[PDB]
């Protein structure tokens, strides 16, 4: 079904953000696992899987709308060097992601692509849940101290 | 069954205390959850539900006694701004509630409303267990330190 | 995540409506139970629980958006003196509630808070289901007679 | 298998009657549900489902006989404005339907299309069962009074 | 609940489209079954059932909004004379249906009938899935050849 | 219970047709199996069994009517040399059979042997279902091509 | 555990190949699903998952050897425009990948990193199995014809 060209461009921009997030979260996960922080490793793994599922739905929607999904261009990974920085890098990426998602919904609404809007709204709900998780972790570090925070994410 | 007017007023006062406690504990629970202190959030949720059940029984007794249950007037909620203050706020509320319960039981005994007395005694037992919980948490904060106390209430 | 100040104000207004509804439906429920109209009592009890669940979600969303949920201010309960009046009072509250939901949805849409909009839309769907129920009961009283209507809600 | 042209014309007339009945009964069902008369709504829904199944068998038979099933022409729906009129409108439609079935069976017999006759006989048995139901409901309204009758069909 | 008069007109227009699709898809299904293409027949039967379920939700919404559901007027069925034409007739119908759905959603949004919008968005999601199915089938006929395509839909 | 002489002659003519069809379908079944077209062979096998059960019911009715069932005379088997001819030979036989069934039913009706008519009507229904199967297979061969048709009947 | 610098460079080169393959196979899979070739889509999906699992193990080994896994640099995807091209693009990519694997194994052997060698050998076995699958599919296209090959991958 021939989709709106700018919708397809917005979907490819969202897709591009998810592809960054897939790799950043996967690498952060395996770093935390290598350091023995396996509760962080596992949670971050599940965050990377969630982004994979979002990218899948985006690819499927783009193809249905008769566009070409861009899996070639990978933007800049934000990789931290310690736990606090890694959480903050994930948070910075998610804040960029939700900004782009909102702008994409505005345009879907304007050209009456209500099904694409519903898909992006669902993704936005998942990203806002990730932001909640990230902000909460960063706050816990301040409340319990870094050493306790890390201790609590070993097992 | 026509109840004693002053018994009904005592029951409405106790109901009023429960209505404050329902909201105060519910808000505290959701604050703790938002901060990632989910074991405190879950416990405080169950405290709120318990107050809801007490309020239900008070409403039912008042109606049986042909009074009007007062769900309109809501007293002052005592909301803390950190874990220590929230616990102390709950405790201050509970100490007021048990003082009022004792006065109501005296009156029920004087007018021979022994069934209303039995209900209030059951509520008093629940409120004293809540006091025990609260005093114990505040004491644990002193024994293990605040960071450890919060750490133990994350998951 | 820093939410829009006016969205938070709208969410607190919706929450305020739910807090009224909780108490009004709960009292109407216990009145109907006291009168032996237990099917009305049971249905109104479940209406009150539904509003409790909506209030919970509103409170959680407000805190996530870094606002303060208002559980202190309780508006005017509309309590009837007989079954017909009680249902109409519920219906009057629900019509106020849905007007406020529609205005809050408008504002969420305009600041691109599409997750808050989706939550409010779900709550609006529940409120229109309650309106349907309430309108239908009032119509049934006219079709079958008050004595039959009440008879069918004894057990 | 090449069927008798006039048989196919009869079958399309019966089909036309079923198509009216599908819509008439389905609308009556949903009107009754909207009014809170859900037992009436459920029974009328099952009547609509029955006509749908008859229409299916007629379409299949017409196609086997190398005719064209007519699903384009929809005759006049008879919609009541109250329970009594709706039942009478169903009954009036059924009495026309059984007259057309009898005339179709006469013709199937004359041209030795014994299988089409057997199908129509089965449909006629169903329509007579519906006539029994409808006459019985209209009689019950007289024996128990409209208010009781409707009361008995709320749940 | 007093609905917007123009929302109700839109809902009756969408319902009119569903009524056409019910009949068109049911006839196509029984044509394919008669021809021995039972996988197509079964798939098209389920499409017809999906439209029946949409029509039901539309009728119920219109009645709740205090409008009259129009089941009397039936627009033009697009019936093909071979498999390729039947799929293209279905696709042409669906493209008109989704155009009308978008226009209806615009109006629901403008008068704040967000529940009607939600129902129409769900239907649109179902219709776009049907468009995907149909476009894919017509593409497969080109890729594998008509003879193979029909072979794969016999059993 | 002594039957009408000419009814018994009709039943014996029908029985004679069924005896031809038993052997013709059984041989066709085993030819297809020998050729590796086992799905055709299995379906034709079940057609032969169907005719065996019809013959059984005819034999039992003739004996009950105190006639002698003719299992001695076997008319001409129509054996094809390839799939299309075999199906056409089956169809030609079925069309003679249904013509004979119709004449027999006319006579049963004239002499008021309604039970024999009902048995012949049931057999006629099965024979018209076989005609449908055969016409449909001949149509599929045209639509998917003989090679694909046979391919789909190998396993 | 401090790894050989050149081993880690080899491991990142193999990882880069896996990252290309993940994306190329995932897109090919979703292209085939969009075209209705679901069996090709599902098989290609499992190939993409396989490469994801290989990339994970390489990431984990690089980190253990105290190197930095390179998830930032993504080489050129080879995307076909039809089924034959897509299979040949996959095969071209696999043949480059196995050449790189062989060179990395040579170097692991020379510096006695026998566990890295074993990991790469396991990956090489999986890639040779993919080469087997792809060569076989391309030959089947020649043996059964493209239309039959695609027909067999519809369901
Ligand atoms: C750095 C790149 C990637 C890595 C290391 C990776 C890793 C993984 C792993 C380890 C799994 C679990 C497989 C299993 O054991 O079942 C997985 C699943 C999955 N991946 Fe990826 N992946 C990557 C990129 C992608 C991309 C780009 C996509 C889509 C565009 C994607 C889509 C999926 C899907 C749909 C699943 C299945 C999730 C489920 O339903 O369980 N992945 N991935
Ligand atoms: C008059 C004030 C209230 C009364 C009498 C009341 C009463 C009740 C009762 C009797 C229950 C059932 C508990 C059980 O399982 O035994 C309940 C459940 C619940 N209440 Fe309340 N409640 C009140 C106010 C509130 C408020 C203000 C909130 C939220 C802000 C709330 C949130 C909940 C929730 C989330 C549940 C459980 C729902 C579920 O289990 O699905 N309640 N309430
Ligand atoms: C106003 C038009 C119609 C409406 C609103 C409608 C509605 C429905 C609904 C709600 C169902 C139940 C679906 C389920 O839960 O599985 C159904 C089933 C069905 N419909 Fe319709 N329908 C309509 C017209 C038709 C027509 C014209 C036909 C055939 C000519 C038809 C044939 C069927 C059949 C065969 C079933 C399956 C019943 C069963 O075996 O359970 N319908 N319909
Ligand atoms: C060429 C002549 C015939 C052949 C090759 C034949 C073959 C068969 C076969 C292979 C079976 C299945 C047996 C089993 O269950 O293992 C069967 C069943 C049967 N046959 Fe025949 N048959 C022939 C003629 C007849 C005749 C002339 C009659 C009656 C007049 C007859 C009546 C039956 C019946 C009643 C069954 C049982 C079917 C059931 O109810 O499952 N058959 N036959
Ligand atoms: O990342 C990428 N996404 C793409 O679509 C792509 C390429 N496309 C070639 C045409 C793919 C195509 C052809 C026909 C029909 C539908 C189709 O989808 C090439 C390189 C990299 C990328
Ligand atoms: O918080 C409140 N509690 C109440 O009872 C109430 C009101 N009463 C109206 C008559 C309640 C009533 C009428 C008839 C028989 C028994 C009854 O119990 C009004 C406003 C607020 C409140
Ligand atoms: O209803 C209320 N909601 C709040 O957040 C709150 C307060 N805030 C302290 C931090 C203080 C009092 C009452 C309330
Ligand atoms: O309601 C309707 N019923 C119909 O058959 C019909 C139409 N016919 C197209 C030819 C259907 C057909 C074509 C070829 C072979 C066998 C066939 O069966 C057109 C419009 C409306 C209707
Ligand atoms: O297709 C049709 N849809 C309709 O509603 C209709 C008719 N209406 C009669 C009054 C329906 C009605 C009456 C009282 C209360 C509520 C009501 O809803 C007449 C003919 C055809 C149609
Ligand atoms: O197919 C057959 N059915 C039978 O009943 C039958 C036979 N019966 C012996 C009675 C012989 C008989 C009875 C009445 C009148 C004339 C007669 O010559 C013998 C061979 C074949 C068949
Ligand atoms: O694709 C990439 N792979 C990487 O490692 C990487 C970056 N490294 C930051 C340091 C990660 C690190 C820090 C301390 C200790 C061990 C560590 O492992 C930066 C950008 C992109 C990439
Ligand atoms: K083939």
Short mmCIF file of N, CA, C and O in Angstrom, two decimals, chain D residues 1-2 61 64-66 109 111-119 121, chain F residues 95 98 101-102 105-106 109 117 121-122 124-125 128-129 131-132 135:
data_model
loop_
_atom_site.label_atom_id
_atom_site.label_comp_id
_atom_site.label_asym_id
_atom_site.label_seq_id
_atom_site.Cartn_x
_atom_site.Cartn_y
_atom_site.Cartn_z
N UNK D 1 -24.08 -28.63 -11.75
CA UNK D 1 -25.26 -29.36 -12.31
C UNK D 1 -26.31 -28.36 -12.70
O UNK D 1 -26.76 -27.60 -11.85
N UNK D 2 -26.74 -28.35 -13.96
CA UNK D 2 -27.68 -27.32 -14.42
C UNK D 2 -29.04 -27.49 -13.74
O UNK D 2 -29.74 -28.47 -13.98
N UNK D 61 -26.41 -23.97 -2.51
CA UNK D 61 -27.25 -24.74 -3.42
C UNK D 61 -27.39 -24.04 -4.77
O UNK D 61 -27.32 -24.68 -5.83
N UNK D 64 -24.16 -24.53 -6.75
CA UNK D 64 -24.13 -25.89 -7.28
C UNK D 64 -25.01 -26.03 -8.53
O UNK D 64 -24.63 -26.70 -9.50
N UNK D 65 -26.19 -25.43 -8.50
CA UNK D 65 -27.13 -25.49 -9.62
C UNK D 65 -26.79 -24.50 -10.74
O UNK D 65 -27.62 -24.30 -11.64
N UNK D 66 -25.61 -23.90 -10.69
CA UNK D 66 -25.09 -23.02 -11.73
C UNK D 66 -25.95 -21.77 -11.90
O UNK D 66 -26.03 -21.20 -12.98
N UNK D 109 -41.13 -29.81 -6.26
CA UNK D 109 -41.77 -31.10 -6.42
C UNK D 109 -42.18 -31.30 -7.87
O UNK D 109 -41.95 -32.37 -8.45
N UNK D 111 -40.98 -30.19 -10.66
CA UNK D 111 -39.86 -30.46 -11.56
C UNK D 111 -38.87 -31.50 -11.00
O UNK D 111 -37.79 -31.67 -11.55
N UNK D 112 -39.24 -32.21 -9.93
CA UNK D 112 -38.47 -33.35 -9.41
C UNK D 112 -37.12 -32.94 -8.82
O UNK D 112 -36.17 -33.75 -8.82
N UNK D 113 -37.00 -31.70 -8.34
CA UNK D 113 -35.78 -31.29 -7.64
C UNK D 113 -35.98 -31.60 -6.16
O UNK D 113 -36.26 -30.73 -5.33
N UNK D 114 -35.82 -32.88 -5.84
CA UNK D 114 -36.19 -33.36 -4.51
C UNK D 114 -35.18 -32.93 -3.46
O UNK D 114 -35.55 -32.78 -2.29
N UNK D 115 -33.93 -32.69 -3.85
CA UNK D 115 -32.93 -32.23 -2.89
C UNK D 115 -33.19 -30.76 -2.52
O UNK D 115 -33.10 -30.39 -1.35
N UNK D 116 -33.52 -29.91 -3.49
CA UNK D 116 -33.87 -28.54 -3.14
C UNK D 116 -35.11 -28.50 -2.28
O UNK D 116 -35.19 -27.72 -1.32
N UNK D 117 -36.08 -29.37 -2.56
CA UNK D 117 -37.26 -29.44 -1.70
C UNK D 117 -36.86 -29.78 -0.27
O UNK D 117 -37.39 -29.20 0.68
N UNK D 118 -35.96 -30.76 -0.11
CA UNK D 118 -35.56 -31.20 1.22
C UNK D 118 -34.87 -30.07 1.99
O UNK D 118 -35.13 -29.87 3.17
N UNK D 119 -34.01 -29.31 1.31
CA UNK D 119 -33.39 -28.15 1.93
C UNK D 119 -34.45 -27.15 2.39
O UNK D 119 -34.40 -26.65 3.53
N UNK D 121 -37.60 -27.69 3.00
CA UNK D 121 -38.40 -28.23 4.08
C UNK D 121 -37.69 -28.01 5.42
O UNK D 121 -38.31 -27.59 6.39
N UNK F 95 -25.03 -39.20 -13.55
CA UNK F 95 -26.15 -38.47 -14.14
C UNK F 95 -27.27 -39.42 -14.57
O UNK F 95 -28.45 -39.08 -14.46
N UNK F 98 -29.00 -40.37 -11.15
CA UNK F 98 -29.95 -39.42 -10.57
C UNK F 98 -31.23 -39.33 -11.40
O UNK F 98 -32.32 -39.17 -10.84
N UNK F 101 -33.16 -42.17 -10.15
CA UNK F 101 -33.66 -41.92 -8.81
C UNK F 101 -34.92 -41.04 -8.83
O UNK F 101 -35.89 -41.31 -8.12
N UNK F 102 -34.93 -40.01 -9.68
CA UNK F 102 -36.08 -39.12 -9.78
C UNK F 102 -37.33 -39.86 -10.23
O UNK F 102 -38.42 -39.67 -9.68
N UNK F 105 -38.65 -41.98 -7.41
CA UNK F 105 -39.32 -41.18 -6.38
C UNK F 105 -40.72 -40.79 -6.83
O UNK F 105 -41.68 -40.91 -6.06
N UNK F 106 -40.89 -40.38 -8.10
CA UNK F 106 -42.23 -40.09 -8.60
C UNK F 106 -43.17 -41.27 -8.36
O UNK F 106 -44.31 -41.11 -7.91
N UNK F 109 -44.06 -41.86 -4.66
CA UNK F 109 -45.04 -40.87 -4.22
C UNK F 109 -46.44 -41.24 -4.69
O UNK F 109 -47.40 -41.13 -3.92
N UNK F 117 -39.54 -43.59 -0.68
CA UNK F 117 -39.18 -42.28 -1.21
C UNK F 117 -38.09 -41.62 -0.38
O UNK F 117 -37.13 -41.07 -0.92
N UNK F 121 -34.51 -40.41 -1.62
CA UNK F 121 -34.10 -39.01 -1.50
C UNK F 121 -32.73 -38.90 -0.84
O UNK F 121 -31.88 -38.11 -1.30
N UNK F 122 -32.49 -39.67 0.23
CA UNK F 122 -31.18 -39.69 0.89
C UNK F 122 -30.08 -40.13 -0.07
O UNK F 122 -29.00 -39.54 -0.11
N UNK F 124 -30.25 -39.93 -3.33
CA UNK F 124 -30.15 -38.85 -4.30
C UNK F 124 -29.27 -37.72 -3.78
O UNK F 124 -28.48 -37.14 -4.53
N UNK F 125 -29.38 -37.41 -2.48
CA UNK F 125 -28.54 -36.37 -1.89
C UNK F 125 -27.07 -36.75 -1.95
O UNK F 125 -26.22 -35.90 -2.27
N UNK F 128 -25.96 -36.44 -5.63
CA UNK F 128 -25.73 -35.06 -6.05
C UNK F 128 -24.45 -34.50 -5.44
O UNK F 128 -23.77 -33.70 -6.08
N UNK F 129 -24.09 -34.94 -4.22
CA UNK F 129 -22.80 -34.55 -3.66
C UNK F 129 -21.64 -35.14 -4.46
O UNK F 129 -20.63 -34.47 -4.70
N UNK F 131 -21.74 -35.78 -7.69
CA UNK F 131 -21.72 -34.99 -8.91
C UNK F 131 -20.97 -33.70 -8.67
O UNK F 131 -20.14 -33.29 -9.48
N UNK F 132 -21.23 -33.06 -7.53
CA UNK F 132 -20.51 -31.83 -7.19
C UNK F 132 -19.01 -32.09 -7.14
O UNK F 132 -18.22 -31.37 -7.76
N UNK F 135 -17.76 -32.72 -10.93
CA UNK F 135 -17.73 -31.46 -11.66
C UNK F 135 -16.60 -30.58 -11.19
O UNK F 135 -15.91 -29.93 -12.00
#
